[PDB]
Design brief:
part of a larger assembly; 2 chains; A: mainly alpha; B: about 50 residues; flat; binds chlorophyll A; binds dodecyl-alpha-D-maltoside; photosynthesis
Chain lengths: ~70, ~50
């Protein structure tokens, strides 16, 4: 019974789980606040909703010269 | 009473998408089967055509 790749071989063995990757790209808190307005919020989100959507829509249409439909 | 109520926000605008635009002061002048106007269409999807 020589051949068998005597316990062949194992791994440790066929476990995997216990450290397969270092976790994450450094970036620590290269953001942290950095931009707050969703990093602040309690309470917001209307505020923003009228703002974003007010520009998008406001300049989204009006003017300068037509370019018309 | 929330009725009658909504029948007048209908009627108001019926008379108010008339008289800055879409004739009378041409349709009274004397009105021959061409195409007197309610309102102005405004859709961004439109072509020039
Ligand atoms: C497939 C789409 C495409 C799209 C996106 C549109 C979009 C539009 N067309 Mg339009 N159109 C198209 C193809 C299209 N068209 C084509 C192929 C033609 C033939 C050439 C036309 C011919 C045409 C004409 C003649 C007109 C438009 C108009 C319009 C606008 C309606 C204005 C309005 O009051 O707000 C959108 C609609 C409302 C705010 C209310 C509509 C009521 C529906 C939605 C009932 C649901 C309400 C419900 C009962 C209440 C609870 C619902 C809740 C969500 C609030 C709208 C932006 C009109 C316009 O600009 O009017 C000022 C004008 O009448 N179109
Ligand atoms: C975890 C994964 C993956 C990722 C996200 C990275 C990321 C990186 N590796 Mg890298 N690497 C990987 C797998 C990966 N590697 C593998 C499998 C090997 C073995 C083949 C290596 C062998 C290796 C070497 C020898 C080096 C890196 C280096 C780097 C860094 C270059 C940054 C720098 O210092 O200035 C240069 C900036 C760039 C190259 C930015 C451009 C980004 C891409 C497109 C390249 C970068 C952070 C370099 C380093 O700094 O570490 C010593 C070094 O050259 N790696
Ligand atoms: C549907 C939505 C909501 C509601 C219920 C209102 C309601 C109102 N807004 Mg208003 N507004 C809104 C959203 C809303 N707004 C948004 C999203 C904006 C953009 C940020 C504004 C920007 C705005 C401005 C700049 C003004 C109003 C004003 C007004 C008031 C007078 C309306 C008017 O001119 O007709 C009445 C017209 C008549 C011909 C009747 C006159 C009879 C008496 C007064 C004489 C009324 C309380 C006005 C106000 O009240 O300030 C003093 C002011 O003009 N609003
Ligand atoms: C049962 C768990 C697996 C096998 C037995 C125990 C393993 C887990 C506990 C022991 C810790 C591993 O041993 C090692 O831990 C740390 C490695 O990060 C080290 O302290 C560490 O701090 C740094 C944090 O960035 C590491 O990057 C350095 O590599 C390391 O020096 C110690 O030098 C050492 O004690």
């Amino acid at each position: 019974d020589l051949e068998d790749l005597g316990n062949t071989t194992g791994q440790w063995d066929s476990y995997g789980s216990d450290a397969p990757s270092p976790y994450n790209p450094l970036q620590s808190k290269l953001f942290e606040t950095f931009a707050a307005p969703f990093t602040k919020r309690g309470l917001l989100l209307k505020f923003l909703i009228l703002g974003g959507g007010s520009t998008l829509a406001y300049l989204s249409a009006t003017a300068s010269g037509d370019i018309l439909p | 009473f929330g009725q009658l109520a909504i029948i007048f926000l209908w009627t108001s605008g019926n008379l108010f998408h008339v008289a800055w635009q879409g004739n009378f002061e041409a349709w009274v002048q004397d009105p021959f089967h061409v195409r007197p106007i309610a309102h102005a269409i405004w859709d961004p999807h439109f072509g020039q055509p």
